[PDB]
Structure 1
Amino acid sequence: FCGKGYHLMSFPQSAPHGVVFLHVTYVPAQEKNFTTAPAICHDGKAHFPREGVFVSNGTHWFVTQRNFYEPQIITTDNTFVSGNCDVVIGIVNNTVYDPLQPELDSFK
């Protein structure tokens, strides 16, 4: 409706009996393919990320956002839990990292 793609905002300009529009528009470029999965099994429960998916760059399983290849480590703060490992299809085995246990154990 504004531009061709993902609109951001617009510039209005004048004509003698009309109007002309300018539309800054987000278009993706330089796309790559990866291996995706809907869920990750760890300790007998199904894990799902906060606002992304599970991706892997061939070996190591990552959490990235939808519109960019910005990977992150699978941790318990960007990933919530629902259900068990059985009822969901597409789930493979990996680990979800704990950001509290080294600070609990090796220091205090």
Structure 2
Amino acid sequence: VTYVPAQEKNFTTAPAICHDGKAHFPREGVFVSNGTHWFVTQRNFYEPQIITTDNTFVSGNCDVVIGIVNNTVYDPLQLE
């Protein structure tokens, strides 16, 4: 008994998402975009999610990553 994916869909990717002077690589899953806003989703299914500070781990300088894309990450600590 096996599992087989189906029904693919083209998207747009980016290695990282640069917030204020940092890199913010994802923890698990790609960084995909619809055509407007960026989301983080799994690798074998399509479950988009908002880019919150618990889905991404941050380490960098926003200078050495080739192909980085500008977007804002969210955090549940500033609100509360």
Larger radius of gyration: 1
Task: Give TM-score, length-normalised by structure 2.
Answer: 0.94
Q: Output the CA distance in 1 between the equivalents of 2:72 and 2:60.
A: 17
Deviations 1:2-39 (A, max 9, x none): xxxxxxxxxxxxxxxxxxxxxx1111111101001100
Specify which structure has the higher proportion of strand: 1
Deviations 1:33-85 (A, max 9, x none): 10011001100100111111110001110000100111010011110011110
Return the offset for 1:100. Answer: 1.5
Specify which structure has the higher proportion of helix: 1
Return the offset for 1:98. Answer: 1.3
Root mean square deviation of aligned Cα: 1.4
Pairs within 5 Å for 1:12-91: 24-91=1-68
Report SS of the residue matched to 1:34: strand
Task: Give TM-score, length-normalised by structure 1.
Answer: 0.70
Higher relative contact order (CA 8 A, sep 6+): 2
Q: Output the CA distance in 2 between the equivalents of 1:57 and 1:99.
A: 24
Q: Output the CA distance in 2 between the equivalents of 1:77 and 1:86.
A: 23
Which blocks of at least 5 consecutive residues in structure 2 are unaligned? none
The list of structure 1 runs, each at least 4 consecutive aligned residues, that deviate by more than 3 angstroms after superposition, is none
* Equivalent pairs, count: 80
